Structures are given as structure tokens and as C-alpha cells.
């Protein structure tokens, strides 16, 4: 999916990743067993990575605006939740809040004009 994102099929990659995250969340909900602890942990890490890629691609395509910020914050909060001990997810979430607040400042300045 990442490769096909790199191969100019960006919107298709984003849609496929939406579907994949939904499917894998359903699988994780269905994955309820004692032996499945390590597999569930790996799947949670994969969900974190998928959500991080979701946010990155959402910014790459739709940019940053009033509509995009809630969705991307949801994606990054989910990514942090699935894998709390991951540096990339937390850094992406924090810098995303940073970008959102700077964008709010800039549009406020535009309003002032």
C-alpha cells in the first residue's frame, strides 16, 4: 500500500488504507484469545503505523484546513493510543497540533486584514 502510494496512486492508496484500517480494527475486535497476546500487540503496532500514514497522506493530499485538522488529529490520537511507546506517532501528533495552531494564527491574521 505504501509502494502504491509512492507510485502516483495517492488517492487510491488513501482509500485502500481507510478500508484496511477498518478491516484490521474489525479483526482486532474479533481477535480475542489468550495465545493471541503477542499477535494482538503486533497488530496494534500495525494500526499505529497505518494511522500515522493515514494522517501523513491526508495532509499530503488535502493539505491543512478546518475540515482536515479534526480528521488528522483523530488519526494521530488513534495512532498514539494503539502504540503509546512509539516516538514517530507522538512526534507526528504533537507537530500536527503545532501546525494546527500556527494555521489558526495565520487565518486569524487573515481575518484581521
Ligand X SMILES: O=P(O)(O)O[C@H]1[C@H](OP(=O)(O)O)[C@@H](OP(=O)(O)O)[C@H](OP(=O)(O)O)[C@@H](OP(=O)(O)O)[C@H]1OP(=O)(O)O
The yes or no reply on residue 106 touching ligand X (CB under 6 A) is no
- Residue 71, marked binder: no
85-109 burial, b at 16+ Cβ within 10 Å, e below that, comes to ebeebeebbeebeeebeebeeeeee
Q: How far is CA 56 from the centre of its chain?
A: 7
Binding to ligand X (CB under 6 A) within 19-58 occurs at: 49, 53
Q: Which is nearer to ligand X, 10 or 106 (CB)?
A: 10
Give least dist CB 37 to ligand X, A: 21
Minimum CB–partner distance for residue 88 and ligand X (Å) = 6
CA distances (Å), 71 to each of 16, 36, 100, in order?
A: 17, 30, 12
Contacting residues toward ligand X, per CB under 6 A: 2, 49, 53
Amino acid at each position: 500500500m505504501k509502494n502504491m502510494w509512492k507510485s502516483a496512486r495517492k488517492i487510491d492508496a488513501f482509500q485502500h488504507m481507510q478500508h484496511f484500517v477498518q478491516t484490521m480494527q474489525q479483526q482486532a475486535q474479533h481477535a480475542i484469545a489468550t495465545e493471541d497476546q503477542q499477535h494482538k500487540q503486533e497488530l496494534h503496532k500495525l494500526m499505529a503505523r497505518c494511522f500515522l500514514k493515514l494522517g501523513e497522506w491526508q495532509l499530503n493530499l488535502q493539505g491543512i484546513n478546518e475540515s482536515t485538522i479534526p480528521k488528522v488529529l483523530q488519526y494521530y490520537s488513534a495512532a498514539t493510543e494503539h502504540d503509546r511507546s512509539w516516538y514517530k506517532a507522538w512526534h507526528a501528533w504533537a507537530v500536527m497540533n503545532f501546525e494546527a495552531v500556527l494555521h489558526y494564527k495565520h487565518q486569524n491574521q487573515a481575518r484581521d486584514e
